[PDB]
UniProtKB/Swiss-Prot annotation, chain A:
<dbReference type="GO" id="GO:0005200">
    <property type="term" value="F:structural constituent of cytoskeleton"/>
</dbReference>
<dbReference type="GO" id="GO:0031122">
    <property type="term" value="P:cytoplasmic microtubule organization"/>
</dbReference>
<dbReference type="GO" id="GO:0005813">
    <property type="term" value="C:centrosome"/>
</dbReference>
<comment type="similarity">
    <text>Belongs to the TUBGCP family.</text>
</comment>
<dbReference type="GO" id="GO:0000930">
    <property type="term" value="C:gamma-tubulin complex"/>
</dbReference>
<comment type="subunit">
    <text>Component of the gamma-tubulin ring complex (gTuRC) consisting of TUBGCP2, TUBGCP3, TUBGCP4, TUBGCP5 and TUBGCP6 and gamma-tubulin TUBG1 or TUBG2. TUBGCP2, TUBGCP3, TUBGCP4, TUBGCP5 and TUBGCP6 assemble in a 5:5:2:1:1 stoichiometry; each is associated with a gamma-tubulin, thereby arranging 14 gamma-tubulins in a helical manner. Gamma-tubulin at the first position is blocked by TUBGCP3 at the last position, allowing 13 protafilaments to grow into a microtubule.</text>
</comment>
<dbReference type="GO" id="GO:0000278">
    <property type="term" value="P:mitotic cell cycle"/>
</dbReference>
Curated annotation (Swiss-Prot), chain C:
<dbReference type="GO" id="GO:0005827">
    <property type="term" value="C:polar microtubule"/>
</dbReference>
<dbReference type="GO" id="GO:0000070">
    <property type="term" value="P:mitotic sister chromatid segregation"/>
</dbReference>
<dbReference type="GO" id="GO:0000242">
    <property type="term" value="C:pericentriolar material"/>
</dbReference>
<dbReference type="GO" id="GO:0043005">
    <property type="term" value="C:neuron projection"/>
</dbReference>
<dbReference type="GO" id="GO:0031122">
    <property type="term" value="P:cytoplasmic microtubule organization"/>
</dbReference>
<dbReference type="GO" id="GO:0005829">
    <property type="term" value="C:cytosol"/>
</dbReference>
<keyword id="KW-0597">Phosphoprotein</keyword>
From Swiss-Prot, chain D:
<comment type="similarity">
    <text>Belongs to the TUBGCP family.</text>
</comment>
<protein>
    <recommendedName>
        <fullName>Gamma-tubulin complex component 6</fullName>
    </recommendedName>
</protein>
<comment type="function">
    <text>Component of the gamma-tubulin ring complex (gTuRC) which mediates microtubule nucleation. The gTuRC regulates the minus-end nucleation of alpha-beta tubulin heterodimers that grow into microtubule protafilaments, a critical step in centrosome duplication and spindle formation.</text>
</comment>
<comment type="subunit">
    <text>Component of the gamma-tubulin ring complex (gTuRC) consisting of TUBGCP2, TUBGCP3, TUBGCP4, TUBGCP5 and TUBGCP6 and gamma-tubulin TUBG1 or TUBG2. TUBGCP2, TUBGCP3, TUBGCP4, TUBGCP5 and TUBGCP6 assemble in a 5:5:2:1:1 stoichiometry; each is associated with a gamma-tubulin, thereby arranging 14 gamma-tubulins in a helical manner. Gamma-tubulin at the first position is blocked by TUBGCP3 at the last position, allowing 13 protafilaments to grow into a microtubule.</text>
</comment>
Amino acid sequence: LHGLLLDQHEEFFIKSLKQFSLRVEILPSYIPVRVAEKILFVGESVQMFENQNVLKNQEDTFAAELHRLKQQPLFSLVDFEQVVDRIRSTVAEHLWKLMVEESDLLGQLKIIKDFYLLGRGELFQAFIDTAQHMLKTPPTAVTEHDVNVAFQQSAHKVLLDDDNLLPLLHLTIEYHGSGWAALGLSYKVQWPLHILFTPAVLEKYNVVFKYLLSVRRVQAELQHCWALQMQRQTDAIKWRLRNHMAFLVDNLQYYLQVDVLESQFSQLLHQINSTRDFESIRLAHDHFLSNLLAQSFILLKPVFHCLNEILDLCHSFCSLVSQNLGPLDERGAAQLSILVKGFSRQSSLLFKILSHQINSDLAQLLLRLDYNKYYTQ
Amino acid sequence: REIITLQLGQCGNQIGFEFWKQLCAEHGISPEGIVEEFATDRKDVFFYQADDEHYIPRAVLLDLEPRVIHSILNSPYAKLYNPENIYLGNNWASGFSQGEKIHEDIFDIIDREADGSDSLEGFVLCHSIAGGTGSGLGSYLLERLNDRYPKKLVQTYSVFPNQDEVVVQPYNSLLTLKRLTQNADCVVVLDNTALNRIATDRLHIQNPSFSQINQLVSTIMSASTTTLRYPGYMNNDLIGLIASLIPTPRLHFLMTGYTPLTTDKTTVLDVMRRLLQPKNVMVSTNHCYIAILNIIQGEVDPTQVHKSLQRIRERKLANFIPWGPASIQVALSRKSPYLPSAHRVSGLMMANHTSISSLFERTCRQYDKLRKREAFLEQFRKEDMFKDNFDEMDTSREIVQQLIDEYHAATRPDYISWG
Amino acid sequence: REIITLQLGQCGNQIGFEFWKQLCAEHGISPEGIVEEFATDRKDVFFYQADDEHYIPRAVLLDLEPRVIHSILNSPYAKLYNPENIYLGNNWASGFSQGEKIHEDIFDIIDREADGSDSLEGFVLCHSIAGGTGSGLGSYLLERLNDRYPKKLVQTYSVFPNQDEDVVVQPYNSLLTLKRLTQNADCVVVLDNTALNRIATDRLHIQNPSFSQINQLVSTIMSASTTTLRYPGYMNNDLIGLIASLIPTPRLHFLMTGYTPLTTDKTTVLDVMRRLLQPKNVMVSTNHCYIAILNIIQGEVDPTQVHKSLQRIRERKLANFIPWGPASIQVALSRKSPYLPSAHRVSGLMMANHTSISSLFERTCRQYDKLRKREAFLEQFRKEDMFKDNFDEMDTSREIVQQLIDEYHAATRPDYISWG
Amino acid sequence: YEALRHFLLMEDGEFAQSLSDLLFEKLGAGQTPGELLNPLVLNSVLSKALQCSLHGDTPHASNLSLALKYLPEVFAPNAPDVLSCLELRYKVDWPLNIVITEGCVSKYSGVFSFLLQLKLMMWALKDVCFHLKRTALLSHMAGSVQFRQLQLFKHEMQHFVKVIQGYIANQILHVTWCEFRARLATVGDLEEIQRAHAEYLHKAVFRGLLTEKAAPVMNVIHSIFSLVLKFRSQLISQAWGPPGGPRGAEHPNFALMQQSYNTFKYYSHFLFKVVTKLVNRGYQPHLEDFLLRINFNNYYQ
């Protein structure tokens, strides 16, 4: 009730999370970890409201209940577990409340959706378009600052001004030692939520943002490169059959995600709307990210190990058309033919892989039948 | 980035005008250009911001010697482009040839709509295919913009005749196809036997078949602008809509399908047999789909769109057979927070059916009937001026016959190279 | 250092009368001149004091001939703008010869009121360009001021000859006035009548009178563009604080003028500054471009907003640019001056050099050419016909203002540092 | 504090211009071997400026005194007092002197002396434009190229020092003060009041260019100021260039008036190259604000 680890020179089995960690070596066998985890959690709970008083007045009642259980000359494990689970409830009933009612966890997650999950399609479209080529080149020292002001510009250039979100939002590159390769998104948070969005969680969102952006930029650059021929020879068949044969792989890794993201996030929002318990909120978000980790295809290791590779095969197509409407049988049409067979062949190894049997992989499964090329070549 | 939205010619002004009308019950804007109180939609894509919340489509009026469309500038929704760009015959050469002196200031009016754009990617031209001055003048603004903005795309919205063969209707069609296949970027082409018999599956509107297909055409250009006007997490731009629909320079005319003809809930699985039907294709020999690219929007429920996608593939009762490797692509998108869409699950096919060429062949049957009777010919006193000896019509006929043959070669393995 | 103001002719009397009737609101003064408690001011910059708080502006009036110069007698306001000093023609030569024959008597009055100061700073004429009496009289008086007192920096409100197309001899009266001004003035605050009629499109349906209706706009514009002289604050206290970037030199002294938001007598400044650059507004009608611009922002305005605001205007790129050098927007920034009504809490106009004005002076010379090639409606009383006869007062006027056109166009290019 | 902002931070521009008019009229009269800096003339102009304020010598507007250290027995050309040893002080009462404080009034007189030499450059602005009015180009009939040139040379310099003036008038008088108007209303402790006043003043020195970290740019400001001082004094003491053609008359050094104006432009080119560096390396929004403004439309005009 008072956040005081009075355990000098000792262990009362509790060793910012350090000196706030459950030891279990020195823990009674007849006390479970199933309730020690509850103890530890309400202990960290008081630890983040006992400061910032420079949380309600029932401590005397709880002390009298604990003295009542102290006076029993027999150990009532179920009542001890019952009262500390009641105390854990009666803090969770307030931590939930401050996270929604006094911290707008919905609005924050909406921001995270809008940026880490590219939920602002118009904004990222204008960002990549206006900030393509200095991130296409390997980055210098000031280009992170330049894409930050181009990001600000992209956020205003859509003319749909939002709640002026920009102050928390900065685009940070691992510079020096390819700007699109080394770029990620940084974010900052307030003390009422600072615990939940511990960097361990945003580190993951950053990799997902990298994934999404990386495919999104190439899927984009391809489609503008297609227009370079469209300004009007037989080679314009091959260049643009090839365009389709590029289009299919990167649209397949991504037209899925447009569904898989919003769908997975529909589960999370209902689990936040479910119940008044921070443990449910916590495990709901843990369930949500650990789900989308699978949806990031990293667990489908072989196709993950061909992601940025086949993305670069699509770069090798996107670059090569950048120069003439005309006939390019000199080598263009020939090196193009490796990309005709390569994408369809890799997609055949992938089709065998799309046979976790999770609905997502079982949707990508769907997208190559009848036109059997991309599992038979 | 952002698109200019020109219109010209009697049909072109009309399908643009009635598209702005159809937006006024699908999208967020009143006839004054004022944003409405039924406005999750981005207007800047096509609509210039004049400061007092006047969303103006980057849109223009040209109509030298019309029949009925003089009344469109006084009809309500024609005002939705407020910036005063009313300016300057009805047959095809009467447009292209007088353009030789007429382009010089309407190019400046287009640059005033380009000043309405933050930085241009392309022009929607709602110019008349067949119907009026945009046949000629619009298909020549194509060239005058190609001369000066050559990387900026022109997508063409269209109408296309086949109603049992005024009866001069086909004569103004063919020259669009020749100039379009010579240089142009895209043509959403929509047919007057196909949408006639689809309209009678939902409405009484057969008396003025031609004038009444404009409503479906307007919904189809609303559809092919939804993911642009709304934050779709794919295909928020013309290049993203088109890029596999037009996998080659020749076959750059496109076709569409709405199965929710009961336009005005049932889980999204429920459309995923009816959507297969070739009877719901609005550009209705032997026909296949070159590739499958389709949409769902509006009432987007995630297990429903996921499992509906599974169930159309489980049935597959449609001719998905050639070399173009997409069995189906869809994803999902946001939509406006108030106004409806087609059965609200809104699903539309855009899979490129080669049947579109059977309508080019029907247009050829019409043009051969007129070419053999030579009766409705009129020779309007500026219509002599483009053809030295009625040669570009015939050049269009060999070009569109190749177009007909090539859509059918694309129905087979042989279209790897021209021959 | 202090103002002296001069309403003259009929139009000039009307717009001066309306200006001081607006300044009846902008400082609380009775029609007899005594204080009213309404409307941070210390009136010393414009008002002399008769010690029972009779607020006396340093102004000289005329009632003159019983043409609409006599409009002052039909008012209750006979001692507001008047220190009891009212001094006792359809064509410029009539108003010029009237000035020429009354010059010493009106000199006496301006000097007597000019002694009504600690020291002076500048004159302010309500001047009708191409008026009957007002051009000629005002443009004569400005020659006499350049002889007798060149030592104050004369400003002048200058309603300009484009009533959407009053007197048909106006083009001659204009180019006679321009021959004077281009060899006399420190500044000329020109306002298009075509564009003042239009200014009204963003507030009201009235845009026809081009006179009585224009007088309210001219009074609001004049009062606003002087409010910070009398409701002071940090900088731009003296008029030559604003005149020096409104007008760069007497070689380019025809000002572009912009009461561009019709609220600029709040939304956040990001929004007002688009409304402040409306090309359908502004009181000015082949590659036209700004030199320096000024916003005299006396507005309830926050520093965090204006940085974001200029940053957004820099990406709308509305202000046409790359002149010879000083192109930047002089946003002076201060609170909304404690009279200017709380309806829309931001105000300050957009006033500049812009070669749109150079086309208005080409149009003014071409309006003279619309007469000179025909000699239409010549009148030919010797009152007119005896002086304007070798045409030099128009031909050389065209030359000196054509050299102003070339210097304005050159000033809209970076090359104009060089001695070519 | 408002009264302190009125007088010491010059928001009563009529006091501050009366002070500037008297002080810099007496300084623009010459007196270059320090001969203006006598206690009695100095007090008379301070007193006279205070009488001409028009706000009045109210209880709030009491307690005003001059200052200097090592009063200069000599001045630089154009008489700038570029080592700014002209100063103002508010005499502090005991209960005021809990929150008023020695370092606070030191930094206050610092910004006062730095803005007061800016008001000397505004006074120079008057003087160089008065040189036009002074001979009035009294030969009314003869237009001049050295007129169209030189009276546009001064146009950029005045435009420049005035946009720097508007900029600094933002950086303190509301960029730093408008936040303090709510920050002082927020607090409820003496020490918080002292500390919030110290925030206001520290950020005023940090935003108003005067800080030791932005000083490399303040050196370019001195480089501009000194050039305009020492080359327009040479105009002040001369007439209007060589005769012949569209002509003025009666000064031979017109090519040096031109070349010094080229040296000014160079230092404004250098200014733009330099100021980017601080906002590319460090984080100073007021310097982005500056270089957003001073070369508003492009790289350089």
